[PDB]
Amino acid sequence: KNILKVIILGDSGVGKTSLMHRYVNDKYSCQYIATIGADFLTKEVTVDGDKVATMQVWDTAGLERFQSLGVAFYRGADCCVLVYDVTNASSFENIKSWRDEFLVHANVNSPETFPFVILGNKIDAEESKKIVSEKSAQELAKSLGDIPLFLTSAKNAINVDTAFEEIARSALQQNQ
Ligand SMILES: *CCC(=O)NCCCNc1nc(=O)c2ncn([C@@H]3O[C@H](COP(=O)(O)OP(=O)(O)OP(=O)(O)O)[C@@H](O)[C@H]3O)c2[nH]1
Ligand SMILES: [Mg+2]
Ligand SMILES: [Y+3]
Ligand SMILES: [Y+3]
Ligand SMILES: [Y+3]
C-alpha cells in the first residue's frame, strides 16, 4: 500500500501551490494567494505501468519566516521538489539553499543519492522577463548531483505531469 511523501520547496511566489494545483486538480488562477500553514494534496500514481502508489504532495509558505509547521514539514519525505521562477534570479540562486535546508532537517542517510527534482517554473513568461537561462539551470543541476530539471508552466500546463511522473518514479525508488 505505497504512500509517497513529496514536498515542494522554493522561494515565495515561484509557483509551488500553482504547480501542485495544476498537477492534482488541473486548476490555475492568475491571482496570488500566499500559502498559510502546511498541508497536502493526494494523487494516485502508477510508475512503469505496474507499480501502484498514492503520492502525498506537501506545500507550505516559501519564505522560511512564514513556514508555520517547521521541521515537521520535511520529515519522512521520499522526494524533495525544488522550484524556481525563471523570471527571478534570486529564486534560482536559492535552489542550493533549499536542497541544503532539506538535507539538514530530513536527516537523510544518503544525501548523494536522495531524490531531488528541480522545476524552473513560469516558462510561459514574456521572453524579456526570462532572466535565468536553461544553460545555467542545467549547469546547476549537474553541480548538485545530476538532478533532473524540468522547465514548467503551471499556467499553460507545460511539462507539469512529466515532471511529476519523474518525481513519482524517483520517490518510489527511495521509498523502496
Ligand atoms: C493569468 C495572468 C497572466 O497571464 N499573468 C502573466 C504571466 C503569468 N505567468 C505565470 N506562469 C506560471 O507558470 C505560474 N505559476 C504560478 N504563477 C503565478 O505566480 C503567482 C505565485 O503563484 P503561487 O503558486 O501562489 O506561488 P508559491 O510559490 O505557492 O508562493 P507562497 O505560497 O510560497 O507565497 C500567482 O499569481 C500565480 O498565478 C505563474 N504565472
Ligand atoms: Mg504557495
Ligand atoms: Y491533468
Ligand atoms: Y534555514
Ligand atoms: Y559517498
Numbering used by the authors: 6 to 181
Relevant lines from the article:
Proteins of the Ras superfamily of small GTPases regulate a variety of cellular processes such as intracellular transport, cell shape and motility, as well as differentiation and growth. For all of these processes, switching between the active GTP-bound and the inactive GDP-bound states is of fundamental importance. We describe here the synthesis of reactive acryl derivatives of guanine nucleotides that are able to react covalently with strategically placed cysteines in GTPases to lock them into their functional states in an irreversible manner.
Extending the labelling experiments to other GTPases, placing a cysteine at the position equivalent to E35 in Rab1b led to covalent interaction with aGTP for all those tested (Rab5A, Rab6A, Rab7A, Rab8A, Ypt7, HRas and Cdc42), albeit at variable rates, but substitution of cysteine at positions corresponding to L125 in Rab1b only led to covalent reaction in the case of Rab7A. We therefore introduced a further change at this position (K38I). Despite this flexibility, the electron density around the nucleotide and the linker was well defined in Ypt7Q35C–aGDP and Ypt7Q35C,K38I,Q68L–aGTP, whereas in Ypt7Q35C–aGppNHp this was only true for two (chains A and B) out of four copies within the asymmetric unit. In conclusion, the structures of Ypt7 modified with aGDP, aGTP or aGppNHp are very similar to the non-covalent Ypt7:nucleotide complexes, demonstrating that the structural properties of GTPases are maintained in covalently modified proteins.
